[PDB]
From a paper:
Recently, bioinformatics analyses have revealed the presence of [name]–Cas loci in bacterial Tn7-like transposons, thereby implicating a functional relationship between RNA-guided DNA targeting and transposition, with the latter representing a new role unrelated to host defense. Support for this concept has emerged from recent functional studies on type I-F and type V-K effectors involved in sequence-specific DNA transposition, thereby significantly broadening the potential biological applications of [name]–Cas technology. To complement the available functional studies, our efforts have focused on structural studies of the [name] Tn6677 multi-subunit type I-F CascadecrRNA–[name] complex, whereby transposition subunit [name] initiates DNA transposition with the eventual help of other transposition-associated proteins TnsA, TnsB and TnsC in the gene cluster. Here we report cryo-EM structures of a [name] type I-F CascadecrRNA in complex with transposition subunit [name] before (binary CascadecrRNA–[name]) and after (ternary CascadecrRNA–[name]–dsDNA) target double-stranded DNA (dsDNA) binding at an average resolution of 2.9 Å and 3.2 Å, respectively.
We also determined the crystal structure of apo-[name] at 2.1 Å resolution, demonstrating that [name] forms a head-to-tail dimer with a dimeric interface of 1931 Å2. The dimer result was confirmed by SEC-MALS in solution. Superposition of the [name] dimer in the cryo-EM structure of ternary CascadecrRNA–[name]–dsDNA complex (in color) with the crystal structure of the apo-form (in grey) reveals minimal conformational changes with an RMSD of 1.19 Å; the loop interacting with Cas6 becomes ordered and the helix interacting with Cas7.1 undergoes slight movement (circled in green).
Residue numbers in the entry: 1 to 188, 193 to 265, 270 to 350, 360 to 391
């Protein structure tokens, strides 16, 4: 097999790339090219040929339960071997990662971009026919919730042709023609959804903040947990048009609420959802995690006010590990040499003020450090 590489586009989905390779190189459709690829990997006896996917909806390494590394090895082999000129294959693939978004959400990665798994579309991938007809390839962005309008054409993305037969470019191709009715698909205008889409695509879109892409998706994920429902594009842009006082109001309303409803006060009692919901969006880089950065700034300045209400709030060993990004052994190790003064991992032995100062004294990194909110 010697394939001709189609013209590269950095924002192309892996599926669209394989469809264009199949088209350019004379294969009937992408499924026939995948079967032929699997057959070639067998002919050269490639250790993972047997698990190479023939279903275009399962081609990404995240779709492989246990053969994800055989999958990436096959992509590297193909990109290095079967082409006139090496293509960027690995760079288009969506991989699992072990990173997380607080409190408990897993993640995927494409190139250097990390996404919360909650936003990864589970069923039918929408498209923009204007992009398909105009450019001839599909965008990786269509795979992720929150990007609901095309940032280039400003129209909602489409899931279904007018005939109720859902259109999925992975199975029904890159021209934007309906399978069943054989008609080209048509569209169906919120300003707030457009801003978010342009922002998630990586472009400056005021009043949304200029953060690395992984942290933009983190903010979508964070707002969904704050609003406790699917992403509300309107109130999200409204939130950042009044930033930072909009967030200072969320913090102040929250602590006042819990004070109304004293030595027993735990950090989770006063600020539970807010604090542990913000730690990893996806990491504690305070230049980029502006939620955690603003929260720590607000807490540092209110530390000893009101007879130390903030500083005396009680914490677990478990919660101190999530704050400091250390292990449980190190907590017990600091207890013994009396670096940290209070074993029981669930007992609320420690004070936020001590944990905060310990962070400053022993656990600041080049990213997780107070200088970014100063
Ligand atoms: Zn478009
Ligand atoms: Zn139709």
């Amino acid at each position: 097999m010697f394939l001709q590489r189609p013209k590269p586009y950095s924002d192309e989905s892996l599926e669209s790339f394989f469809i264009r390779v199949a088209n350019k190189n004379g294969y009937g459709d992408v499924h026939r090219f995948l079967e032929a690829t699997k057959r070639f990997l067998q002919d050269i006896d490639h250790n993972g040929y047997q698990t190479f996917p023939t279903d275009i909806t399962r081609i990404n390494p995240y779709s492989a339960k246990n053969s994800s590394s055989a999958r990436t090895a096959s992509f590297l082999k193909l990109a290095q071997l079967t082409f006139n000129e090496p293509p960027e294959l690995l760079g288009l693939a969506i991989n699992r990662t072990n990173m997380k978004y607080s409190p408990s959400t897993s993640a995927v990665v494409r190139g250097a971009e990390v996404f919360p798994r909650s936003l990864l579309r589970t069923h039918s991938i929408p498209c923009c026919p204007l992009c398909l007809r105009e450019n001839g390839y599909a965008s990786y962005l269509w795979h992720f919730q929150g990007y609901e309008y095309c940032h280039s054409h400003n129209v909602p993305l489409i899931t279904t042709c007018s005939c109720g037969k859902e259109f999925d470019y992975r199975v029904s191709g890159l021209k934007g023609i309906c399978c069943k009715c054989k008609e080209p698909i048509t569209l169906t205008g919120h300003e707030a959804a457009c801003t978010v889409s342009n922002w998630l695509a990586g472009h400056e879109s005021k009043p949304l903040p200029n953060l690395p892409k992984s942290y933009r998706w983190g903010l979508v994920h964070w707002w969904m947990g704050i609003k406790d429902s699917e992403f509300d594009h309107f109130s999200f842009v409204q939130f950042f048009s009044n930033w930072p006082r909009s967030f200072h109001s969320i913090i102040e309303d929250e602590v006042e609420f819990n004070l109304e409803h004293t030595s027993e006060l735990r950090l989770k009692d006063l600020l539970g959802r807010l604090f542990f919901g913000s730690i990893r969006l996806p990491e504690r880089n305070l230049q980029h995690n502006i939620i955690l950065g603003e929260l720590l700034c607000y807490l540092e300045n209110r530390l000893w006010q009101d007879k130390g209400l903030i500083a005396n709030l009680k914490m677990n060993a478990l919660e101190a590990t999530v704050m400091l990004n250390c292990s449980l052994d190190q907590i017990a190790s600091m207890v013994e040499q009396r670096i940290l003064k209070p074993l029981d991992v669930t007992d609320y032995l420690f004070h936020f003020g001590d944990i905060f100062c310990l962070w400053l004294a022993e656990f600041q990194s080049d990213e997780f450090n107070r200088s970014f909110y100063v």
